[PDB]
Design a protein around this ligand. Structure first.
Ligand code: HEM
Length: 457
């Protein structure tokens, strides 16, 4: 029966936006959810959002007949350079359906067999980099895991080598990409956009978009003109036809899809690898069980596809790091028609709901009371986990098309790290989680000692 909905402190006319004027907004909304409960209204000048935290309400918010993906304010800002790629378009835009239908078979677990050798290439570069460190040096974990995921998506994506392990300062496309992304998350905070001084940032944003567009546009043009067939996603987009309409993707959208795979895949997947290594280094018993499995399964100088799939406990370790810190922490929904949530909170057509995934993954009624503990074994039998309890890759037909690509990568890389190195938390690191569109451990450094096992070819 109809209930109330809390609201945090307001600052009249600015309403609750100062509560989000922090460098850590998701972790600040997790402190607010702890004191107000499973749903709360958050209001800013112009918008109203309700944040959901319990599986009880989120299983309802995940019914596709009543709710659909919303383009939140962050995604509308990202659409300026990601366009109508899969991530920043509405389900009912014609290009979302057409790209979804063409790309879906290329992102299956069976299609990972074709991208495997390209993922091993960048994985071996990372391992070889750490093999070659001298005994006085340490690893900057988030920074080499972002080198590893940029280069893997560049090479599986459009067969281009960004050669991030050969540089100190990134290839200028990556610099533009990070800076555009950065600019788009800063426009959220700036309650006074367009003009004062911002027009310098705004001028700069136009140039970063031009660098992205120009490099990708050229790759596509050179590709159609030479016509060689590789096993990257760009050839599957260039030769693919939507079975519903019979149409191909146009060249401008193919570009947006390539920019979208970079921006949607690089930080989420490297954040994941960083958090999994943290929790392993902080939990020696888990590390030993994971390192044992890697040494038993990965018996060849380079892992085969079938060997990565047998790395059952490494997969449980990554699932539990995604429970505790889902690297893309919230997604947004809008009500399709007037409806009631739970049987007690009235919603109107078009109201926005935001799923706060890190809180969902801390619901004591589903996970038990050791919710804050790192226990991979929670996932030993994955069918025993209630529907809509575990949502790190979103929901339904708008879930992460790249789910299988991210988990194969992460399992491959984590299995080879544990196989080849013993790790030491030489500084006794204290977790500080930096927020962008994504979450990562800021400053996590480790020392790796080699077990001197050959990494051949
Ligand atoms: C640890 C890894 C990752 C996590 C946690 C993650 C999570 C997510 C989430 C939560 C969404 C839904 C967002 C929303 O509903 O607004 C999503 C969508 C998407 N992700 Fe991922 N992602 C990851 C890896 C990747 C990778 C590697 C790629 C691509 C190479 C990728 C590409 C996509 C795309 C294109 C969409 C949009 C699908 C659609 O709407 O049709 N993601 N991802």
């Amino acid at each position: 029966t109809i209930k109330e909905m809390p609201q945090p402190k307001t600052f009249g006319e600015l309403k609750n936006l100062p509560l989000l004027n922090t460098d850590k907004p998701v972790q600040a909304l997790m402190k607010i959810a702890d004191e107000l409960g499973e749903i709360f209204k958050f209001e800013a000048p112009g918008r109203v959002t309700r944040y959901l935290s319990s599986q009880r309400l989120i299983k309802e918010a995940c019914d596709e007949s009543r709710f659909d993906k919303n383009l939140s304010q962050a995604l509308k800002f990202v659409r300026d350079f990601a366009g109508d790629g899969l991530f920043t378009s509405w389900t009912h835009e014609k290009n979302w359906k057409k790209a979804h239908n063409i790309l879906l078979p290329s992102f299956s677990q069976q299609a990972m067999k074709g991208y495997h050798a390209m993922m091993v290439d960048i994985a071996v570069q990372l391992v070889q980099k750490w093999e070659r460190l001298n005994a006085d040096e340490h690893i900057e974990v988030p920074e080499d895991m972002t080198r590893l995921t940029l280069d893997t998506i560049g090479l599986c994506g459009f067969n281009y080598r960004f050669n991030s392990f050969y540089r100190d300062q990134p290839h200028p496309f990556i610099t533009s990409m990070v800076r555009a992304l950065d600019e788009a998350m800063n426009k959220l905070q700036r309650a006074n956009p367009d003009d004062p001084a911002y027009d310098e940032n705004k001028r700069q944003f136009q140039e970063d978009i031009k660098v992205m567009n120009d490099l990708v546009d050229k790759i596509i043009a050179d590709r159609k003109a030479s016509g060689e067939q590789s096993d990257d996603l760009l050839t599957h987009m260039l030769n693919g036809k939507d079975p519903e309409t019979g149409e191909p993707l146009d060249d401008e959208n193919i570009r947006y899809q390539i920019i979208t795979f970079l921006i949607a895949g690089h930080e989420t997947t490297s954040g994941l690898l960083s958090f999994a290594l943290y929790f392993l280094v902080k939990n020696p018993h888990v590390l030993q069980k994971a390192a044992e499995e890697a040494a038993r399964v990965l018996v060849d100088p380079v892992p085969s596809y079938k060997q990565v799939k047998q790395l059952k406990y490494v997969g449980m370790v990554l699932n539990e790091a995604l429970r505790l810190w889902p690297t893309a922490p919230a997604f947004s929904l809008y009500a399709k028609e007037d409806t009631v949530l739970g049987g007690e909170y009235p919603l109107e057509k078009g109201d926005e709901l935001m799923v706060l995934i890190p809180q969902l993954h801390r619901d004591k009624t589903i996970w038990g009371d050791d919710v804050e503990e790192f226990r991979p074994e929670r996932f030993e039998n994955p069918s025993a986990i209630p529907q809509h309890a575990f949502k790190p890759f979103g929901n339904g037909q708008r879930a992460c098309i790249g789910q299988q690509f991210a988990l194969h990568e992460a399992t491959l890389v984590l299995g080879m790290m544990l196989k080849h190195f013993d790790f030491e938390d030489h500084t006794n690191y204290e977790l500080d989680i930096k927020e962008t569109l994504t979450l990562k451990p800021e400053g996590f450094v480790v020392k790796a000692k080699s077990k001197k096992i050959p990494l051949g070819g």
